[PDB]
């Protein structure tokens, strides 16, 4: 039925397409987070770089 | 100042460790939020896709 089928297809397309938009972009955000954290780690590496007997003798005797 | 430094260093180290703990917890939240979205909207939105078919017939 036009009303129900139209609204539920609007549902499918609009909302879940949008949801995958969210998935993608939030994944982008998290990737940014992790990469910049690792970059800080490498920075810290570089900066801390900037912040910088008798038994032997007798053994030798016997063994040789 | 040596103590203020050790204390500030403790604070710097604290903050480096706190940051480290939070570097871990931010990544855990980045991964948990990721995983929850990745599994939650991906599964429940999928379940609504399945609704498109589940409720057919």
């Amino acid at each position: 039925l036009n009303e129900l089928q139209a609204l539920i297809e609007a549902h499918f397309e609009n909302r879940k397409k949008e949801e995958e938009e969210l998935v993608s972009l939030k994944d982008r955000i998290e990737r940014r987070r992790a990469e910049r954290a690792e970059q800080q780690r490498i920075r810290n590496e570089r900066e801390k770089e900037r912040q910088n007997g008798k038994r032997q003798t007798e053994r030798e005797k016997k063994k040789k | 100042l040596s103590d203020k430094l050790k204390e500030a260093e403790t604070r710097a180290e604290f903050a480096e460790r706190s940051v480290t703990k939070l570097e871990k917890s931010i990544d855990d939240l980045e991964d948990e939020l990721y995983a929850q979205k990745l599994k939650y909207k991906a599964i429940s939105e999928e379940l609504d896709h399945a609704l498109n078919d589940m409720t057919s017939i």
Binding site: L4, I8 | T55, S56, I57
Partner: peptide, 29 residues
């Protein structure tokens, strides 16, 4: 699953009407 609460009602009406007729058809003798 409102789509089928609604489909259910439609089929319920279709069968209820067919059933009303099954019952009448037998009741009519």
């Amino acid at each position: 699953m409102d789509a089928i609460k609604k489909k259910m009602q439609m089929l319920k009406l279709d069968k209820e009407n067919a059933l009303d007729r099954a019952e009448q058809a037998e009741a009519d003798k």
